[PDB]
Amino acid sequence: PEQLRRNLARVVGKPPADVPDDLIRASLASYARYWREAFRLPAMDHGRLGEQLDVIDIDHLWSALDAGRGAVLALPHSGNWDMAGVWLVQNYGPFTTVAERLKPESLYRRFVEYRESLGFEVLPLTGGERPPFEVLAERLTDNRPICLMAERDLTRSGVQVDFFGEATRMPAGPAKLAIETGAALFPVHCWFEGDGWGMRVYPELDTSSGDVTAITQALADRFAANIATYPADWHMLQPQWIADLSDERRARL
Numbered sequence: 001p002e003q004l005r006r007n008l009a010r011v012v013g014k015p016p017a018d019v020p021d022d023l024i025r026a027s028l029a030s031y032a033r034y035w036r037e038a039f040r041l042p043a044m045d046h047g048r049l050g051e052q053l054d055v056i057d058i059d060h061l062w063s064a065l066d067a068g069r070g071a072v073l074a075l076p077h078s079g080n081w082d083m084a085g086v087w088l089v090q091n092y093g094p095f096t097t098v099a100e101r102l103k104p105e106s107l108y109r110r111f112v113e114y115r116e117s118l119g120f121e122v123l124p125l126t127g128g129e130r131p132p133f134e135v136l137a138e139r140l141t142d143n144r145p146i147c148l149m150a151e152r153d154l155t156r157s158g159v160q161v162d163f164f165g166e167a168t169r170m171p172a173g174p175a176k177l178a179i180e181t182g183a184a185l186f187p188v189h190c191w192f193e194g195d196g197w198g199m200r201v202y203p204e205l206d207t208s209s210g211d212v213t214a215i216t217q218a219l220a221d222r223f224a225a226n227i228a229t230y231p232a233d234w235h236m237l238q239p240q241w242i243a244d245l246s247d248e249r250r251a252r253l
């Protein structure tokens with residue numbers, strides 16, 4: 001929660017101590033909401049949810065699928081992305097994503113089972129039969145959408161980007177995959193809209209530069225704007241910016 005307050009501090013442009021309490025509270029409530037919904041989501045009526053929820057400017061994505069190009073959906077950890085996944089499973093069909101191999105492995109199996117029970121194809125980031133960005137590239141070249149959580153990746157291979165005015169690292173995947181396949185790179189946002197769910201697809205990012213860092217920066221900028229729009233719905237309770245890392249963690253990346 002303290003790191004969350006310190007992160008919202010980045011979000012609202014105030015020192016951590018002055019971030020309104022109500023915002024931190026609302027962010028914690030949205031986070032709790034995420035987990036409460038995640039618990040029960042697999043047992044809900046997905047058809048109904050698919051029929052009754054809407055996505056703003058979804059036609060962006062559809063036209064990409066009609067043009068045979070495939071598509072990369074990159075979004076931050078805001079709202080309920082699993083719900084978005086359900087909406088896409090219901091409105092388009094199964095899609096592919098990737099997940100960190102948490103510890104213990106039994107918990108990883110729990111999560112895989114969970115998302116697979118929502119209808120997603122989930123690739124292990126490490127330890128799978130084949131390398132993930134080959135299956136993903138193959139999914140994209142077959143004109144299918146993939147979804148990637150794309151605002152956090154503090155490893156050596158993560159891309160250094162500016163985010164709310166300070167240095168962080170984001171995964172290279174959306175840009176790498178888009179460059180390699182020509183697939184449309186749509187930013188996405190999910191947030192909580194009252195007792196319902198708000199979701200939107202944004203205009204695709206230009207990949208003509210073929211440069212992962214600029215593109216990841218544009219993506220980051222959009223993420224920053226969308227998070228700026230719904231700060232309480234971005235549950236990033238883990239460290240995000242490089243400056244909040246210890247010297248030992250700053251080293252590993």
Ligand SMILES: CCCCCCCCCCCCCCCCSCCNC(=O)CCNC(=O)[C@@H](O)C(C)(C)COP(=O)(O)OP(=O)(O)OC[C@H]1O[C@@H](n2cnc3c(N)ncnc32)[C@H](O)[C@@H]1OP(=O)(O)O
Nearest residue numbers: 073081084085088097098099100133147149157171172173
């Ligand atoms: C409303 C819309 C609906 C939206 C629905 C949303 C639903 C979302 C739900 C999803 C829930 C998710 C939960 C949260 C999960 C978040 S995890 C975030 C994942 N982020 C990623 O970017 C995933 C992609 N990961 C990768 O790309 C990594 O595997 C990479 C490739 C970056 C690792 O890089 P590296 O370790 O630095 O590799 P190197 O380039 O240093 O060299 C090693 C590998 O390079 C690879 N490589 C080099 N060039 C190349 C080369 N051009 N294309 C390939 N791969 C090469 C090469 O394969 C080689 O391996 P080898 O071939 O086996 O020896």
